[PDB]
Amino acid sequence: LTLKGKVILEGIIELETGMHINPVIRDAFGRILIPGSSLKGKIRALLERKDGLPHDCGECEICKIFGPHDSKNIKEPVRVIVRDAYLQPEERVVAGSKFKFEVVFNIYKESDKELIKKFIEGMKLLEDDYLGGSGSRGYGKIKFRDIKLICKPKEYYEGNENSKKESDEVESLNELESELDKIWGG
């Protein structure tokens, strides 16, 4: 199963609420950041709760995206990688603070549009819940803002520089689904 392309979802994460320092960590080098696996983890939790130890099998909506809990069960390669969200310049983090975030999508099949859409819908579920905490009482609300999509098709890595297309910045997740459709090369 060859790789057809990468779809990077770059953007900004903003804090509506203050945050102490599981969700927000302070790097070994002193840098403030939100660990990618934390973010991705809460997205797993919500995206799995809205479908009725994370899920672990080959064929499934959630397990094709985030990958199964065990590596002995991978039928198809993992499609999503959530980069660590580092704090941008201009114990508790003040509200209004911005973390530049990046989400990498590995597209192998032409039906993985709905996987990306499922992840973005997960982000929408997280936008109106809480980053830190789980289940009954979460803490620190979060809002996604300024989101661009970048397409790096197989033809881009092979040498074609202009095959790399980039959508323009949208203010919310809801506007992504259109900008997603306006970008599909492979």
Q: Does 69 contact Zn ion by CB under 5 A? A: no
Give 65-104 as a DSSP string. Answer: HT--SSGGG-SS---EEE--EEEP---EEPTT-EEEEEEE
CA distance 63 to 60: 5
Q: Does 29 contact other proteins by CB under 8 A? A: yes
Only one of the segments 40-48, 61-69, 140-148, 157-165 lies at the binding site for other proteins (rule: CB under 8 A); that segment is 157-165
State the distance between the two ends of the chain, measured CA to CA, in whole angstroms: 14
Q: Does 158 contact other proteins by CB under 8 A? A: yes
57 annotated among ligand-binding-site residues: yes
Q: CB of 113 within 8 A of CB of 127?
A: no
Which of the residues 72 through 131 are near other proteins (CB under 8 A)?
83-84, 86, 104
Between 88 and 172, CB nearer to other proteins: 88
Between 20 and 31, CB nearer to other proteins: 31
CA distance 176 to 145: 11
60 annotated among ligand-binding-site residues: no
Q: Does 21 contact other proteins by CB under 8 A? A: no
